[PDB]
Amino acid sequence: TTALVCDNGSGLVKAGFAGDDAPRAVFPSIVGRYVGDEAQSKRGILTLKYPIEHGIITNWDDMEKIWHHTFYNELRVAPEEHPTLLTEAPLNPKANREKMTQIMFETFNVPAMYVAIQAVLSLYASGRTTGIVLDSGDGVTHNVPIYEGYALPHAIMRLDLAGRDLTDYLMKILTERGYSFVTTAEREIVRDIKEKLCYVALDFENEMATAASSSSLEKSYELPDGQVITIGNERFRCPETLFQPSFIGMESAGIHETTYNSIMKCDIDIRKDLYANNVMSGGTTMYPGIADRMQKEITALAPSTMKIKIIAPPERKYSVWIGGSILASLSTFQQMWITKQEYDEAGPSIVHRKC
Amino acid sequence: AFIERPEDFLKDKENAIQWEKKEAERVEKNLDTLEKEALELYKKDSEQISNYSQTRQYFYDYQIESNPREKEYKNLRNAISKNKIDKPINVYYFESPEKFAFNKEIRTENQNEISLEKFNELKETIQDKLFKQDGFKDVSLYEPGNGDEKPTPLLIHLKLPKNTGMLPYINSNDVKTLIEQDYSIKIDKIVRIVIEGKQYIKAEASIVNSLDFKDDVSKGDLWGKENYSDWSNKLTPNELADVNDYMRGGYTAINNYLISNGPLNNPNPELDSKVNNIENALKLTPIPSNLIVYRRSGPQEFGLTLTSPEYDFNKIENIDAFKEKWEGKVITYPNFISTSIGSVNMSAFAKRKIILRINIPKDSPGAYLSAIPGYAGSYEVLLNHGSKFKINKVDSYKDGTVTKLILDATLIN
Ligand SMILES: NC(=O)c1ccc[n+]([C@@H]2O[C@H](COP(=O)([O-])OP(=O)(O)OC[C@H]3O[C@@H](n4cnc5c(N)ncnc54)[C@H](O)[C@@H]3O)[C@@H](O)[C@H]2O)c1
Ligand SMILES: Nc1ncnc2c1ncn2[C@@H]1O[C@H](COP(=O)(O)OP(=O)(O)OP(=O)(O)O)[C@@H](O)[C@H]1O
Ligand SMILES: C/C1=C/C(=O)O[C@@H]2C[C@@H](CC[C@H](C)/C=C/C=C\CC1)O[C@@](O)([C@@H]1CSC(=O)N1)C2
Ligand SMILES: [Ca+2]
């Protein structure tokens, strides 16, 4: 009776019930070869494996295990008893969404389901149907411009640069400082340092002079064994990578430039609406200073008369999930569910007609 | 003069000029006001207008679209392509030897002779190469002679086929001929001649046409889908499985296996089988026309990294060093290699500085991958593992403040 909302990410699954204001369960998107924190409790005879890569499901057997674990272990429900809303990346291939649909109906025997675009859900969580979304997670970042509830596929930008790359970069530059962060467990520690101490500088070259000249930017962090370490310019060099991907050897546009490129690929008539509704979602948009920095970078690229607004809600770590919870619980959405009967009548390709 | 023009006016300057004068007068009747305007602007700003016509296609789609220089480029190109010759004609023009990757003087302008030394060096340099040409160019219907202007020691004598666009026009006292280059040049033969007391190299040249979509990625995508829709449905389940695995990111493992020479010293039957299937997929529907593709290379393909001092092509010394190392050389990729039918810059490789511009002979192994639903935004042509490319010529251009390189290359296997 109550619908399920399962937001499947490269790093984390966020799962819960439509109508709740937060996911009941958030757990790592890993299998052992065991799922989640079980997959690493016995990671000996086994190795941690991520089935979703850069936002796309790449292993269907492993993903079935993730979804198994979601229904039975995390939410403690029967799939046969709950319509289930799944999320997907922008530009998810059509064969992927067909395969998600097949698995839901033929493996899990759900009474109904639906597949929603993550960026559209996050926009909707703030009550908008028009805007440009920067969605940045553990594995992938997108710019998705949306006009009156429709994602605009020809203007979507994708960068394979996100939180896990930032973590790995932080391990490296901390190691160059004189520490040693290299193992899988140390990678978890540095993710934690990243999530607690990093920020985006408003003026990067300025910030690098300051730090070189004072201890004013230094912060301390206590390791699990009680060793306390110091972190300095690494705090802001780490997420600076989003704006300067050459920091990790990438020759792609940074997130400010992809946001501008995306807007420039849209019809000229709607660009002002996009500039006025830049919305951020996902864990990798949580850095203090990121909204101000994006404001400054986009101001430099755009016409001098352009009114630019960056919207970054405190909840934006879960705004895809929240959007799914709102959507799945709307009166006017109920006609949109794909029922098991519709699946029987029409193939997996029923997803394309209903979404 | 005869009633019908010759294919080559040779030294008959008086008839060439008169004929082209009548031709300029006839074509005036087919150009609308905007095209005539385009011609007038070209007369006034030819160098910059030609320069734009050579490198316009390498920027972001939206940067190209909003450049006001597009209007002149489009309107002039239309004026030219309209007026198609109905049988071949030979033309004459001087080039810098640098244009054909001879980066030194054949002789100085004050010298009258060319050494056998230089002659043979030039021959070895421009032999067995297909040189890509772009942009607007003024040519002569007659061979320059006593009292004609001759800016370099290299005269090109080019044969242009039927249906070549040529725009005859008058610029004050002079009768001219405009073309837009859109082909590759083969130099069939060079000879040393004498004009007005000085030795010149005369290059006997012909053209090779290729499909080059440049920034028109929609036209290129239509062509690709046109030719590879049933290739998509003719693969064995094994081949489709392995191609999709490759495309889905399996490429990194497969290609590293290949580059590290895994088949030799660390065989892996599972990977070998995939390599074979992908190759067989690429031989299933060979590239059905001569085609130009574009690849934005990582610096590691040319033995550089992001922080290599030698990757700063804003310094001419680094361009020279790159040319000395790579220009005229053949390079091999043990890996399968991705290219696009489009020349436009993209977000994912916006800052890459080395562009490969590759001529693919008809019937080469290859496939328009983007004919498979799922990820067609690449406009991708996958080339076979172990491909060899001859680097014919290295050009450079500015992308904002950043100097980037265009490597004119040819697939030779
Ligand atoms: N680069 C392009 O112009 C282009 C064109 C079409 C599609 N794509 C798409 O982008 C992705 C492929 O990206 P890519 O082609 O930039 O990655 P790639 O796999 O070709 O390159 C990965 C890295 O390895 C290097 N490399 C590749 N071959 C090498 C060799 N033989 N020796 C030394 N170094 C070598 C590259 O410089 C790069 O640093 C695919 O999804 C593909 O469909 C890229
Ligand atoms: N406060 C924070 N500051 C910086 N990064 C954070 C913060 N909180 C979480 N992250 C990072 O965000 C990522 C997880 O976010 P999210 O759950 O949105 O990604 P995902 O959906 O698993 O991945 P993707 O959307 O790329 O498929 C991790 O890399 C995590 O370290
Ligand atoms: C609090 C937390 C947040 C998180 O996002 O974890 C996700 C998932 C995690 C799986 C590996 C181990 C089992 C994690 C176990 C338990 C809980 C999740 C940890 O791999 C990440 O850590 C990677 C590596 S480091 C980084 O930047 N992304 C992202
Ligand atoms: Ca996500």
- The helix content of chain B is 25-40%
- What gross morphology of chain A would you assign? globular
CATH topology of the largest domain in chain A: Nucleotidyltransferase, domain 5
Using the coordinates shown, work out and report the CATH topology of the largest domain in chain B.
Answer: Toxin ADP-ribosyltransferase, Chain A, domain 1
Which band does the percent of strand residues of chain A land in? 15-25%
Structural class of chain B: alpha+beta
CATH architecture of the largest domain in chain A: 2-Layer Sandwich
Biggest interface, chains and residue tallies: A-B, 22 and 19 residues
DSSP strand tally of chain A:
18
Number of domains of chain B: 2
| Number of H- or I-type helical stretches of chain A | 14
Calculate Rg of chain A over CA atoms: 21 Å
The share of residues in helices of chain A is 25-40%
Strand order of the largest sheet of chain A: 3-2-1-8-9-18
CATH first level of the largest domain in chain A: Alpha Beta
Largest sheet of chain B: 6 strands, mixed
Please tell me the total number of domains of chain A: 3
SSE ordering of chain B: HHHHHEHEEEEEHHHHEHEEEEEEE
Please identify the oligomeric state.
Answer: heterodimer
- Name the overall outline of chain B: globular
Structure explained in plain terms:
The PDB classes it as toxin/structural protein. Keywords: ADP-ribosyltransferase, TOXIN-STRUCTURAL PROTEIN complex. It forms a dimeric assembly. The entry is titled "Crystal structure of NAD+-Ia(E378S)-actin complex". The complex is a heterodimer of chains A (355) and B (413). Chain A has helices spanning 37-41, 60-75, 94-107, 118-125, 163-177, 184-197, 204-213, 234-243, 255-264, 271-275, 290-301, 319-328, 340-345, 350-354, and strands at 4-8, 12-17, 25-28, 31-32, 48-49, 52-53, 56-57, 84-88, 112-117, 131-136, 141-147, 150-151, 157-159, 219-222, 228-231, 278-281, 310-311, 338-339. By secondary structure, chain A is of the alpha+beta class. Chain A folds into 3 domains: 1-117 and 316-355, ATPase, nucleotide binding domain (Nucleotidyltransferase, domain 5), CATH 3.30.420.40; 118-161 and 251-315, Nucleotidyltransferase, domain 5; 162-250, Actin, Chain A, domain 4. In chain A, the strands form 5 sheets. A 6-stranded mixed β-sheet of chain A has the order 3-2-1-8-9-18, sandwiched between helices. In chain A, helix 4 crosses helix 12 (319-328). Chain A is globular. The two termini of chain A are 21 Å apart. Chain B is globular. Chain B starts with 12 loop residues before the first helix and ends with a strand. In chain B, strands 1, 2, 3, 4, 5 and 6 form a 6-stranded mixed β-sheet that branches. In chain B, strands 7-10-14-13-8 form a 5-stranded mixed β-sheet. In chain B, helix 2 (33-44) crosses helix 3 (46-55), helix 2 packs across helix 5 and helix 8 (237-259) packs across helix 10. Chain B has 2 domains: 1-211, Alpha-Beta Complex (Toxin ADP-ribosyltransferase, Chain A, domain 1); 212-413, Alpha-Beta Complex (Toxin ADP-ribosyltransferase, Chain A, domain 1). Chain B has 413 residues and is an alpha+beta fold. Chain B has 11 helices and 14 strands. At the A-B interface, helix 3, strand 13 and helix 9 of A face loops of B. Bound molecules: nicotinamide-adenine-dinucleotide, adenosine-5'-triphosphate (ATP), latrunculin A and calcium ion.
